[PDB]
Design a protein around this ligand. Sequence first.
Ligand code: RLT
Ligand code: RLT
Ligand code: MN
Ligand code: MN
Ligand code: MN
Ligand code: MN
Ligand code: MN
Ligand code: MN
Ligand code: NH4
Ligand code: NH4
Ligand code: ZN
Ligand code: ZN
Lengths: 163, 163, 365, 365
Amino acid sequence: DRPQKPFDKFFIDYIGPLPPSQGYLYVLVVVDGMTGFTWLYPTKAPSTSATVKSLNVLTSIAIPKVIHSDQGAAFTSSTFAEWAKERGIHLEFSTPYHPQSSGKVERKNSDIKRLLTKLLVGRPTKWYDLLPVVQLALNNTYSPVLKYTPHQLLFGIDSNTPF
Amino acid sequence: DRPQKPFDKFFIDYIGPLPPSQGYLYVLVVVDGMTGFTWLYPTKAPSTSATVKSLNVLTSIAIPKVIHSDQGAAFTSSTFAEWAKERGIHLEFSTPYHPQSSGKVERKNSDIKRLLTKLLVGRPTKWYDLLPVVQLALNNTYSPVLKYTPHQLLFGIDSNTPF
Amino acid sequence: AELDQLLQGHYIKGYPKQYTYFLEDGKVKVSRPEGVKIIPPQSDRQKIVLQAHNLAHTGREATLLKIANLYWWPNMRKDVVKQLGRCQQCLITNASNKASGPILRPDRPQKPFDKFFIDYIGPLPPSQGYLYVLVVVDGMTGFTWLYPTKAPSTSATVKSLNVLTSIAIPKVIHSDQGAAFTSSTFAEWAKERGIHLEFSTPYHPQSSGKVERKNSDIKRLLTKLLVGRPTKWYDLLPVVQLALNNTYSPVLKYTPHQLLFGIDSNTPFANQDTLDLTREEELSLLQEIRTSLYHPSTPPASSRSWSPVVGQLVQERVARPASLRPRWHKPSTVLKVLNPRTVVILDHLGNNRTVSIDNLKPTSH
Amino acid sequence: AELDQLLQGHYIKGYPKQYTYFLEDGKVKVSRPEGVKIIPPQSDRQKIVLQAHNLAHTGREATLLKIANLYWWPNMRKDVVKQLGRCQQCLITNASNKASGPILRPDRPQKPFDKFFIDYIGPLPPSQGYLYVLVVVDGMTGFTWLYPTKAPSTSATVKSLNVLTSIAIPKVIHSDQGAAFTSSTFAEWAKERGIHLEFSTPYHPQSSGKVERKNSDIKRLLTKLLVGRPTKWYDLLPVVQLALNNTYSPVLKYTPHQLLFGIDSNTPFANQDTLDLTREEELSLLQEIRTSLYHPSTPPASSRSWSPVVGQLVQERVARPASLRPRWHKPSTVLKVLNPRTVVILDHLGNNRTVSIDNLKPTSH
DNA sequence: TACAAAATTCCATGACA
DNA sequence: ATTGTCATGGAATTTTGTA
DNA sequence: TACAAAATTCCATGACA
DNA sequence: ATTGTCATGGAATTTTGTA
Ligand SMILES: Cc1nnc(C(=O)NC(C)(C)c2nc(C(=O)NCc3ccc(F)cc3)c(O)c(=O)n2C)o1
Ligand SMILES: Cc1nnc(C(=O)NC(C)(C)c2nc(C(=O)NCc3ccc(F)cc3)c(O)c(=O)n2C)o1
Ligand SMILES: [Mn+2]
Ligand SMILES: [Mn+2]
Ligand SMILES: [Mn+2]
Ligand SMILES: [Mn+2]
Ligand SMILES: [Mn+2]
Ligand SMILES: [Mn+2]
Ligand SMILES: [N+]
Ligand SMILES: [N+]
Ligand SMILES: [Zn+2]
Ligand SMILES: [Zn+2]
């Protein structure tokens, strides 16, 4: 077939609820299918509404052909369904309770959860201001395959913040 | 000697008092010795002070080498005397009661007095607004010698308001 | 549609043979040097160009470059340009890439008092309760009269000019379309005296340029006289007036005063050269000088300039554009061409307007 | 004095024989082609030139022309020019007649995130309580981020940039010396992240020119999207951002987005050309394109330009000149020449200032 | 070894407080 | 201690489809 | 049928809200 | 129905005092 590329598919999910920081409670996690590049968006609820506001931000930069997600209320709603049709994004759903997504993504998706709990504890209340640092760390971290940071795969150059 | 020229000598005198117009009472009359060109300045008193204010206006246009006048208090004062030295104007005085000035000037100086009384009567109160019209008429009036208007002698061209 | 024939190997105007034209997914595709592109049916193509353009309201090349990605047909640009002409938005917002023609250098008035140019300077710092200066310049000689005023008003302009015209009356007064000179009260004052009023085109100070250029010299000399001191200009005006009227133009080798009177008054460094001539001899020598004065010619056209042709699609710049709103008015037509630099246009919509090219752009396309 | 000898027929350096030099009224007069002029004793001549000049603070030719009327001596102008150099007034008020040198065209940053350029737009009409836009442009790609703010403030700039640097961290941020970016709070925010701050010379937007030029394109497209409608720009920003980041530069034949990512996202008219290459092949093809980009050269010097030499008498333009006050500061000296267009000067008096030639005039004389 | 006309490239002009 | 930029649309130059 | 250097003229640059 | 102007100071060109 045609070899895989950035923006081909975006995997999204909600982490939460978390201890309140700046009155936020949830993190919407967007990983790019091919590169493993990650975006993190703090939200006040795992709602279609907050999803749209968040994804509006991301889609000012780039628009994926496909979004994959679990059948959570937020993504199954008809409003989200319409939002995506407007922007010409095809929506893709895992079947209930059997969350199929990429080998590479599962791992990255695991790392986030560990890395969140890790630096969450000790300052469980101030994780909002840390999200930039986290995102930066994740995206500039060498994958065992490729020996490339997601950053490198997306931009084809080196970041000025290595790990 | 050297033939006579505009700005060579300015003859000045006060006409007044007149019926009040716009709260003015006197007319300071300045005729140019060679051309016969006339300026008229309304004043509130035949004083050095009002003379200076008036002549400051005229001397923004041109400065005569000489000013001739009667020995009236206004021109004999030391303030006027200093005013003239500052501007490098030599002052010239007729002897008391024997007012020697130019043949051409005496006539022009007569015309003004007639022309003032003439259009003064009938509107003795509104002669201020008329001073432009008078000045214009006088200066654009053919002298029997030269067959030139003072205007012509000063500017060496025709005015767009003949008489 | 008409694309039917082509898949079957038969020729069409444009559509050059040698490329194989095939079918995929019910679309008519074509193999080209650039790659394999889709060919839309005639009826879809306007809709396509518009969609591409409306992304960022891009020009010819920018628009075509998007379309090139997906599609091909014959004479692509011809179609794109057809759209750029109809985008009401792009036409009234984009700036011009065409400079206006070379300026004109109208001739010196022939006689002093043939034409006065007037303008107001200000507001300034308050001196003695006055805020503005009325500057009057004689077009021929460059001789200048200054008058302090409290406001740039018709009433005060009249007061000032009544004094000035005590000396002589001009044929014509040229002014900008400032409130003070356009008023009916002024217009009549002027008709009362048989003086023709003449106005420069809207928002083009360059037309009142003979006065404007005197304004420069006024402000400059006042500035110089006020270094250190508090800005007390009122009492300085006379001095400036005199100083400036007796200043040599290096090009003419003559002070305005000289051109007005033909002799220097009792000024510092008064030139004596004509001391031996009768007034008469002198007066005609002056009359000579006035005609033999240096007069500039118009400059070469800039390489990408334009000139106004009768019946041309032409647009006027907005007066005081609001924040984020179009810098140009809708298209309008050239009615008459007064000179290669002044035009009458049927505007919005529609009144005859006299306008300077500098406030115009040619509608492109 | 020394003029004694001359009346007696003996020669002096200058003072050319063939003219008869006589005495009248205890002054030394001379018959010349131009006419009969007075020759002042050496010790009077400065006093003379100054008197003439101080009439209207006139330049070389204008001053000389007054003096010519009454006087003559050898090398008149040399003396006049000696004065024009010492008139503190003329030096700080007169404008320059020398254009600055040809501009420089610094090289494209090599990599994306090598250098960000930032600037604030505004104030605008209020939408949703916001008044300004923070525009961030990547120097290499031209890729642009937009952020609505309520004030052009350090605090809000930090908030915005924290979001942006979530994606990546730049080496260098270039900004104008606006209050928001010069503040100590910002300087530290930047040091915290190992980002070098760099500022353009005072009052020279052209230096932040890469952002400024994006501002144009932003305001233009917003204007176009708001014709008819009330100015509700807040919700439009995203669209503009996208639209502009995916617009082809006709010169490069590439959208910023392309230069940043090497592939088009799920945008309208997304270019497919590289659909067959692995990410890797594609990624290095991109790395090639970036280096082979079109880069402009500096333009020819204008025929009457100047360049800054070390130890030159040079003057800085006034910040916000008051009404009727000098448009230039007192003379100051060129300390170092950073490039043919940027200078360090010991000013008033004295601190090292880094300045652009465009804000300088060479002291004349 | 050549044409007319399309397709491309050139580049002055203007505007970003 | 730092430094102009580049969409735009006619003109001008090059490439193209056919001999 | 001539020189160096003064004296003149040329003219781009900038600014008049 | 109206329209750019011109001081300024280096450069460039011409004239000048002497052979
Ligand atoms: C109708 C109508 N409504 N408004 C205008 C109008 O022209 N308004 C402006 C603000 C531009 C203006 N400017 C100047 C002036 O001298 N400006 C500076 C300048 C001088 C010379 C040069 F070449 C360029 C600029 C005025 O004197 C003046 O009165 N006005 C009104 O016309
Ligand atoms: C220190 C210091 N204090 N004040 C300044 C300063 O520069 N102030 C001005 C008002 C001139 C300014 N202007 C722009 C701008 O973009 N102007 C328009 C433009 C853009 C490009 C081009 F080539 C010409 C003009 C800004 O963004 C800006 O922030 N400022 C402050 O610096
Ligand atoms: Mn979930
Ligand atoms: Mn008396
Ligand atoms: Mn005005
Ligand atoms: Mn004006
Ligand atoms: Mn700024
Ligand atoms: Mn700016
Ligand atoms: N004319
Ligand atoms: N550079
Ligand atoms: Zn458009
Ligand atoms: Zn001076």
